[PDB]
């Protein structure tokens, strides 16, 4: 039941501050570390930073000057701010739970000073403490992401948001494959990404495929979603495509009705 | 800062593939490497942590190992669903500082070939009443995922106004693609027919629509 929900703006102008929030459930926020990871389009995963159970934060060294991470245990929320954003900061941003642990081990004979009542150094003879052989402990760092959030796509652009226009792709005799028929919806001219599509409020999942968007020369995106249904059901069963465009807080339901031919 | 992974690795169905992850003494060599699987259109999934420990729900055909500054993710009994991007990671000089690999795309060869099924939608009545016209050509259920799409007006090629998406995987491990032809409603009613022509593995499927036809 460990769930992580990123929230924040989908579009931000250059030089502005990107502020994201992560709402958590299924685990105690005050006893687990939460981290932010991002992935720019076509690039590799990039660590941003984390905050642990004690409230202490660690950041990516190359980006530390632009990053701020805070949390509120009583609200089950963790925040992330990125200052002076540019096009290079366009990415999917992930909230995560992270295992974090530093181990300091000493060889045989040498004892860690934190054990024997340079607290993080080894000592051969704790009785000497002054004439004792001392070394540096073998330090290993453990970090892995446990759970991943669904991610929030953030586009850095000076262009303006635009809600989508949804048009039916109605089946006909030129759209059937015998017992099955294809129908869909064309989601045209929206900005920015992403758009998700479901069918009959999610009650229809088999045969569904939502195609990746295409970038027109106008700067707007378009995509299509298709579903295969029995051809005999076109007269009776009604089919509705549910379009979700969070950047503009738009939801569109479009009934796809069959053509006469 | 960025661990070194091969850009792409290939294997056949049922066979074995190893993905390498090379770093330095301050990350991979420090000895606690993790592995993550990214399927297109899905959140990342943790597969391996602590070099060899397997996360719950991960099949035992995923296995991790490490030798010095190089870690390896081995995938055996290779299945079509394994096609994804794979990233390694480890801490670097702090348990709150992570570095990731450059990523590896896994392709699973030896899957059943399939010719594409093409569906061409004419501009809808609603879009026409908005003084716009888009022809939508949907291509589905083909393998391998490499098609070429061409458009015709009556019988001459059409180059302008065409946008085509790169083929991506469906839920049944077959590939799908889409292509669009944007026209004015006048151009739509001008010619006698429009065609979407898809070439795939020495096969060509062409669908035609006509403004005079329903």
Numbering used by the authors:
A (entry chain H): 1 to 82, 82A, 82B, 82C, 83 to 114, 119 to 262
B (entry chain L): 2 to 9, 11 to 27, 27A, 27B, 28 to 95, 95A, 95B, 96 to 106, ...
Published text:
The cow antibody repertoire contains a unique subset (~10%) of antibodies possessing ultralong CDRH3s, which can reach lengths between 50 to 70 amino acids. The unique CDRH3 structure can be separated into two microdomains where the antigen-binding disulfide-bound “knob” sits on top of a long b-ribbon “stalk” and can bind to both surface and receded epitopes. Ultimately, we isolated a total of 8 and 11 cross-clade nAbs from cow-485 and cow-488, respectively, all of which had ultralong CDRH3s, suggesting only ultralong antibodies were responsible for cross-clade neutralization detected in sera. BnAbs from cow-485 were named Bess, while bnAbs from cow-488 were named ElsE and assigned numbers based on their order of discovery.
The ElsE Fabs all have CDRH3s with 54 amino acids and 4 cysteines, with a 1–3, 2–4 connectivity, Bess7 has a 61-amino acid CDRH3 with 8 cysteines (1–6, 2–5, 3–7, 4–8 connectivity), while the 55-amino acid CDRH3 knob region for Bess 4 (6 Cys, 1–3, 2–5, 4–6 connectivity) has no ordered electron density in the crystal structure. Ultralong bovine CDRH3 knob regions fold with 3 short β-strands connected by 2 loops (Loop1, Loop2) of varying lengths that can adopt a multitude of different secondary structures, including loops, helices and β-turns. The ElsE series of Fabs all have highly similar knob structures as expected from their high sequence similarity. Low sulfate occupancy or flexibility in the CDRH3 knob region may explain the lack of electron density for these groups. The ElsE lineage was the most potent and broad overall.
